[PDB]
């Protein structure tokens, strides 16, 4: 019922920057939170940041604070994930997801219902 | 809701089933609640403190599962689906007690005889505690939705006969079953309550075609929580959420949120009413044991003194007092009937203060020993029938305040949350019972000692219950003044 | 008081089928059972089919069971009776009646109170 379109994937070297974007095609309403999850190959999935469509509060992951920014655009209905000071440890696959409830946990992966294909980003 | 043809007969078989499934869901709640402490202190051996704490945890679950048994009705299943689910637990839990009592199967369930049975009692009580806290929040709005098509005149005429049928289960259960339990047997005594709830499940299910039901709408709550988040994390403060004010939410949705902010202050003003109303149910029975009872005798029959007037005053109030107040414009609202009902509770507690004050005078002269329920009490030489004046004034308070509290809770809640708001109503009545239970202990502290000498099955002549009642009236005259302040502001902004 | 008007009657050959309509008016909020009755010449009036307006639970007579259908239209406050594979024996006058209490023996005429003009059906 809800599908998210990824974009902006690419690869850069150390010290580079990227602007990842993941669009949505499902109901604009009925969605409470949007989050970005980074998962390296053969590694457990982990969350990066979350954004609420009603309040705007952002919950950046403790391990990536200060180097990534996420913003919402109601007109375009497509969130963005600005990234700077990229490092090799950030090389991993990325996912964007939505949920019908986030007052429990904004980052825990066992809450989001709808997921997306995801995009791979490599930092050298 | 109903087609034109046959409407009249379709709302007498939809109110006969709801009223005959609350008489049988109630005749099976006093079957277990009434003679429980007595049952446990049997030859096969809980103590006085332990037995009561099972009857205080059992009630605690009943109040604390109403709001959560209402949210489940307005979000997932609906009022009809969830009542059938609840009566399944209510019956499933009620099957533990007959097995426990029976010597044949007692060993299998309780366990090896101690050559006790705590495991089977609590699993039995918890399930029954869940069933009665969720049926009690979904049958009251579900019942009154059948007749809502005929305006508020017909809703009020329902709660009159929905409260005369709940009080006809107390007289039928505290009188009939209680006698069978003590004297005849406990296997037979505890088997009728299990059968009674069995019939209630079937009668409710069979009449599935009379009722008019509405599908659940879960988006009502999801939107409601978001409104709170937007307002608190960012004229009443809920106005911004509207589109007209620039917010991202609908208009009528914000109206429902502002309806809960206004109802809540009224419920918090009734906690003093419930506190000084569940203490008169308990302290009166203690007083009756200490009066000359006319010349075994179950201790339950002393409790149905007031459920034999509400059985004879509602027919009188529903055909002689309601019409006379209708043709004349005298008392139409529902928050003006409660404020009248909280006035007879004041005169009832004060009335019992004078009766007790004179009673303590007599015992200093002479006393007569008597035995009720296997124990002995030092009763005074004064007939128990002097206690009628303090029970009539409570028969007039459960007609204006108990029957008008339900009507106001139903008729002042958003149509999408009519079970979560009757659920809260029955949860703020639990906060009332337990606030009083703490009030009794406080006044019985060593410093004051108005009832320190009182114990389990204990004489109260040394105690001073006289002062206690006057304190109940004092705390009930304060709330009456307060409830008029909050009530006026509610109607003013309505 | 209530009023009923029959219609749909006519003369057909063997094997015909008609949809008799019987509208109701007046204070129609106190009608529990509706039914149809046949009265052949020289024989006492007999019921054909009955219906309930509160549950929808129909009834039928063993004489004509399995070939007649009775339904209600709450929108039009009209009842339709359908006959399949008619016989010359069934040829007789027909009536539709109401009843404010008929849960016992709905097919016995003495239970019903209101009555209509009636219609005649000829089969040969």
Author numbering:
A (entry chain C), C (entry chain A): 1 to 124
B (entry chain B): 19 to 62, 64 to 134, 160 to 278, 301 to 361, 371 to 569
Sentences from the paper on this structure:
PHT1 is a histidine /oligopeptide transporter with an essential role in Toll-like receptor innate immune responses. It can act as a receptor by recruiting the adaptor protein TASL which leads to type I interferon production via IRF5. PHT1 (SLC15A4) and PHT2 (SLC15A3) are found intracellularly, in the endolysosome membrane of immune cells and they were characterized by their capacity to transport histidine, short peptides and bacterially-derived peptides such as the muramyl dipeptide (MDP) and other nucleotide-binding oligomerization domain-containing protein 1 and 2 (NOD1, NOD2) ligands.
In this work, we determine the structure of chicken PHT1 together with a synthetic nanobody (sybody, Sb) in the outward-open conformation at 3.3 Å resolution by single particle cryo-EM. Overexpression of the plasma membrane mutant of PHT1 (PHT1 L12A/L13A), yielded higher amounts of protein compared to the construct expressing at the lysosome, and was selected for structural studies. We obtained a 3D reconstruction for PHT1 bound to two copies of Sb27 on the cytosolic side at a nominal resolution of 3.3 Å. The EM map allowed model building of the twelve transmembrane helices, statring from residue 19 at the N-terminus until 569 at the C-terminus (out of 581 residues). The overall structure of PHT1 adopts the classical MFS fold, where the N-terminal (N-domain, TM1–6) and C-terminal domain (C-domain, TM 7–12) enclose a large cavity that opens to the lumen side, a state defined as outward-open. Access towards the cytosol is closed, caused by several tight interactions between the N- and C-domain. In particular, a salt bridge is formed between Arg200 and Glu482. In both epitopes, the interaction is mediated by a CHS molecule which is sandwiched between the transporter and Trp103 from the CDR3 loop of Sb27. Sb27 stabilized PHT1 in the outward-open conformation by forming an interaction network with the N-domain of PHT1.
